[PDB]
Amino acid sequence: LPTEAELKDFSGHITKHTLVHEDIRKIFDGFPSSTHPMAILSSLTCALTGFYPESISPNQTPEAIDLTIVRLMAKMSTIAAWTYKNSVGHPLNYPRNDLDYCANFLYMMFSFPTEKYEINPVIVSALNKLLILHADHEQNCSTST
Amino acid sequence: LPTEAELKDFSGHITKHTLVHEDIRKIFDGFPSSTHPMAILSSLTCAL
Amino acid sequence: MAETAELNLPGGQSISLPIFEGTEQEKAFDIGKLRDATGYVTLDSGYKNTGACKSAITFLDGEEGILRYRGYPIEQLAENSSFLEVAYLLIYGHLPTEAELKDFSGHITKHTLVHEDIRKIFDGFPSSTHPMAILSSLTCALTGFYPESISPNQTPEAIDLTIVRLMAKMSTIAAWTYKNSVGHPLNYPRNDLDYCANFLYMMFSFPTEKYEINPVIVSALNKLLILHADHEQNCSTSTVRLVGSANASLYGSVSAGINALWGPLHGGANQEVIEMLEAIEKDGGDTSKFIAQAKDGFRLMGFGHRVYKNFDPRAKIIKVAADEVLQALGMQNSPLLKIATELEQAALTDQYFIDRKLYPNVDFYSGIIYKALGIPTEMFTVMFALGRLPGWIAQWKEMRENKEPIGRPRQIYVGETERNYVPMTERK
Amino acid sequence: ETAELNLPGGQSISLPIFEGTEQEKAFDIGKLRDATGYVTLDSGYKNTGACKSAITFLDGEEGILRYRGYPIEQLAENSSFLEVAYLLIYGHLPTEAELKDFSGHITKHTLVHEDIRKIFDGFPSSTHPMAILSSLTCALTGFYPESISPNQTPEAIDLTIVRLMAKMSTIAAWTYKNSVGHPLNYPRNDLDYCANFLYMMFSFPTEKYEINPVIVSALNKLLILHADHEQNCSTSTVRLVGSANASLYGSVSAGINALWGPLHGGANQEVIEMLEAIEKDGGDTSKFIAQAKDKNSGFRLMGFGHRVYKNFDPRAKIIKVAADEVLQALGMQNSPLLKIATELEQAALTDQYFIDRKLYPNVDFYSGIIYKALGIPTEMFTVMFALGRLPGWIAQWKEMRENKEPIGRPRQIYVGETERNYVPMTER
């Protein structure tokens, strides 16, 4: 369990890195609105190695691995919300600096640029619970992959 | 081992389908020239 | 009280040359009749001994460490002026009225917004493109978007519009060159920040981290840019005047000046200053090894100067700001300040440095402030261009208003004398 | 041997004499400012020798032009563009093997990177071709960062030169395709330089392009006639920017911006506009010849006069005759524009006003009429000058670097305000 300082650095680093490179947004631009979100999630996820070639170098230092971990925890939230916006033809929301991980995902997914989005702490806290229940399950097909 | 007709249909069908959708070319357009080829191969392969 | 020079050309021929005395006792002889009356030209290596123009803009004396914009000492403009006030002074000749500095800074605010089509041109540059390629190429493009700017016979109204558009858009486009390199989305300029603050926002604000406008950083940037605003005649300023003398657009003449500034021989523009500080940090932060081994460059790394003997009069002012910037962030006991002080006190006390007059110049300190702000090495010459821009513009405008003729020098031919074309068959 | 210069006070200095291989004479003011504190004063460098050069001999008094001692008339009649480019750059007529090597390397490098094509995608069809040409040439330093790295190997430099000669042709054709909304052509490796340019520009899918050997010949000749002209403004820009060790790409981009100015290469566009205006007015050419003499009527005789030629321009005399031949060879009998042009020269050359002021047609006066006849629109005329002058720019840059010229740092005489104290805003 992290100390208050460990969780604040971990969650702060994740917040910083939720911004996805403009070139990945332009790759995303190529996908028709009809594309299944999972095609985009998997496709943009393997493009990250191309943008972060240090991630596949031999001799990963612990510091380098820590940076890959916060990059992927951050950017998965952003790209996941892109896959929804793509299906409905809405503009992409930039992530916010002031929202916690789950609130920021809900904002990126459901906010319009046409009005302040009302964040419902009931939905934020229900999403925290659902993600926690799915966080790990030992040696299933996806984890073994 | 294919008969002459099986290999000709198999190799003919492959020839027809070597053309990649214009939208996949536009996804490809997004990748910087510096990107490692394996990033593009894997990424375009899961877009299919 | 007018003098004359007498030139006695071998063969017995002689000419009287009128002497021109400037307002700081710089003397020239007028060779305006030399070729037509004698058949002779001067031969001058790198124009080192040639008065290309008369300027009311900037007086510089390197032996006496003096520098003035329009008579006003550099020390007093830096400590008390603002970049746009100094831009107005350099360009229009006097310290502005309250209404003048208001309208100028207001018109610049309105025009910092760059056309969507120039943003689409910018979209094509890969993220790895050196920022100076993008700065020079997009400045170049502006003449295409503002064709009126290469019209013959532009109203002074039109020329003033060109001047605010470029002062405005240079800051936007410089911020784009940084965003491109880190993959960040472009910021729209804001209507409610002043010139330097809007630049820092456009450069450093990004959706996932709070950007607060620190007034100490604003004050430091205003002094950096003031101190780079003009430096008399030099390669890049001469380029801007020469391209301008052909009636090129201001945009085209500045594009050419940027490419001159990019040259590693220019002086000042030396992104090796930030490179120095980084190479040392990575090598465990030990100065006295890089210094030791960088003997067995130096002008490229913020040490010494071509014009100024003894000391750079801009250096000791930006030294102050460099200290306030380090303390306004959390860097009082950082590797930067440590590495900085070791280098500087090799310069200011190691005799080898006192011998070859390698004192820290304004860019040694500028490179420290820039490294402090997280401005990368490949942006150093862009920050130089952004400061020098109003000087370029003032030098271009003076050149136009004095209706200087096209710069078209002569040569002495030292090639082959007349010989007939040999058709390809009859050669080898 | 020396000239002797007597200044007020006892001061006297011996300025050495230098005489070139065509008896052009200068005295060396190299040490003037260090020995005396004086400079020359010389507006537009009408009296200053910028350099020694073996590239091109220009006798403005007699109207003589040679490239490396080869008469222009003989090269224009019998040589080709790339042969002249080779001779200008490398200093001799190529052997059969050298010219095949040079044109072969140039053919390979004609393909422009897909990211430069995408930058080009951003320019609207309304953009003046020269904005596009200057902006993309500028971008090239971004794509070939080795070209600005210090210690260029001769091999490195040679690859820069072939890259630029090649890509200027492809990009110049893009600027035309942009204006008419046609898809870009890829270069064709089975076509010579001029035919490849003509195919890239004029081939479009819905009309059979035939390579016309008359058009290919006419283009080779015009490009040769534009190839070099000694120390003109744009060439002086390329050397100045280049003396800072800027990339060839950056130096040539600054050159293109100088050439665009109406007082330089931009004049060819204005000449054709004058001939069309006289065509439209319908009026006697003698009317405009009088208007031309009328100190301020609004009407200047464009394409007459030159800084150096006080006589016929040999390039104008060749293009005048070739315009007749080409229009005849293409079935364009009696160009109304050619008649007005030949009538303007007829009246001007016999009219004492013009003869006393040494006002003859220059290269710009007849060139538009031939470009027009090849299918080249007015807004491409200065692009065609840039494509011709390129190898001259390259030759001049290359010789400037091989001579190890120091950075170009012209001087001023200050004529502005003496030390005056900063006056805060509230006190003004």
Side-chain angles (χ1 to χ4, degrees), chain C residues 87-104:
Chain C
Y88 195 102
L89 171 60
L90 282 171
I91 293 168
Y92 293 98
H94 66 276
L95 294 169
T97 69
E98 211 187 30
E100 278 171 350
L101 182 61
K102 181 194 186 211
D103 281 272
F104 193 51

Side-chain angles (χ1 to χ4, degrees), chain C residues 2 8 16 81 95 100 146 159 193 200-201 203 208 211 219 262 278 310 314 318 326 354 361 370 377 391 404 415 428:
Chain C
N8 296 326
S16 195
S81 208
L95 294 169
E100 278 171 350
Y146 301 108
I159 289 159
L193 298 178
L200 284 159
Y201 160 82
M203 186 109 153
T208 53
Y211 193 66
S219 172
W262 202 356
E278 289 191 341
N310 306 321
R314 302 165 302 168
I318 197 59
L326 291 176
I354 304 284
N361 63 45
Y370 290 154
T377 60
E404 295 279 3
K428 75 206 318 180

Side-chain angles (χ1 to χ4, degrees), chain C residues 147-159 162 249 396 400:
Chain C
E148 54 263 52
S149 75
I150 200 172
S151 277
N153 314 305
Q154 296 178 44
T155 67
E157 284 62 43
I159 289 159
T162 302
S249 67
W396 177 88
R400 294 296 283 277

Side-chain angles (χ1 to χ4, degrees), chain C residues 3-8 10 19-20 22-24 26-32 34-35 39-56 58-59 68 70-73 76-77 80 85 95-98 101 117 121 124-126 129 133 136-137 140-141 143-145 150 232-235 238-239 242-243 245-248 252 256 259-260 262-266 306-307 404-422 424 427-428, chain D residues 1-8 17-18 20-22 24-33 38-45 47-54 56-58 61 66 68-71 74-75 78-79 83 93-96 99 115 119 122-124 127 131 134-135 138-139 141-143 148 229-233 236-237 240-241 243-246 250 254 257-258 260-263 307-308 406-423 425 428:
Chain C
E3 312 173 289
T4 279
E6 171 190 304
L7 175 50
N8 296 326
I19 291 175
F20 188 87
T23 46
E24 288 285 343
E26 307 174 284
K27 296 153 290 184
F29 44 97
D30 184 346
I31 67 175
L34 185 55
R35 210 202 170 249
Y40 274 87
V41 293
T42 67
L43 194 49
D44 195 13
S45 187
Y47 303 96
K48 287 175 198 151
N49 307 260
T50 300
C53 58
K54 294 172 184 173
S55 193
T58 287
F59 175 64
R68 292 162 210 151
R70 301 283 191 181
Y72 298 110
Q76 301 172 36
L77 294 170
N80 294 269
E85 196 172 60
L95 294 169
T97 69
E98 211 187 30
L101 182 61
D117 283 335
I121 289 159
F125 285 91
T129 309
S136 44
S137 161
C140 203
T143 317
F145 285 85
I150 200 172
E232 201 233 70
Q233 311 307 309
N234 60 60
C235 187
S238 295
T239 297
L242 183 57
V243 175
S245 71
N247 282 0
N259 274 294
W262 202 356
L265 254 62
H266 192 288
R306 170 202 315 270
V307 179
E404 295 279 3
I406 189 161
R408 205 302 184 197
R410 301 307 293 267
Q411 55 175 35
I412 307 295
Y413 181 74
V414 294
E416 295 298 313
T417 58
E418 174 183 359
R419 53 171 169 177
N420 290 330
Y421 183 65
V422 189
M424 178 56 91
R427 270 179 235 165
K428 75 206 318 180
Chain D
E1 167 176 12
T2 57
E4 207 268 308
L5 175 59
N6 292 318
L7 293 160
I17 299 285
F18 184 82
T21 54
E22 297 278 358
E24 286 162 319
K25 327 178 78 175
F27 54 90
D28 198 347
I29 59 173
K31 306 196 185 215
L32 178 55
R33 212 199 77 91
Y38 285 82
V39 290
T40 74
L41 182 63
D42 192 19
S43 67
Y45 304 107
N47 292 271
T48 300
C51 62
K52 305 182 196 175
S53 175
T56 287
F57 175 59
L58 172 49
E61 285 68 47
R66 301 186 194 112
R68 300 274 185 189
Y70 296 97
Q74 288 183 44
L75 298 176
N78 294 317
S79 198
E83 183 170 76
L93 289 170
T95 76
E96 162 161 45
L99 176 62
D115 287 318
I119 296 167
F123 288 97
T127 316
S134 59
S135 175
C138 216
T141 318
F143 287 82
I148 194 148
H229 214 230
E230 198 227 75
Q231 308 307 321
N232 60 78
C233 187
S236 291
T237 293
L240 185 50
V241 181
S243 64
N245 261 1
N257 270 300
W260 198 5
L263 296 186
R307 167 68 59 86
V308 180
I407 185 157
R409 295 181 43 79
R411 298 295 199 125
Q412 59 173 40
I413 292 291
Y414 183 67
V415 304
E417 294 276 7
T418 36
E419 166 155 15
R420 74 211 281 217
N421 272 334
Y422 178 72
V423 177
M425 179 59 81
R428 287 168 205 178

Side-chain angles (χ1 to χ4, degrees), chain A residues 124-138:
Chain A
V124 159
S125 125
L127 187 53
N128 266 281
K129 206 146 153 201
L130 262 178
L131 296 182
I132 289 169
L133 292 175
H134 291 86
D136 196 73
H137 220 230
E138 209 235 47

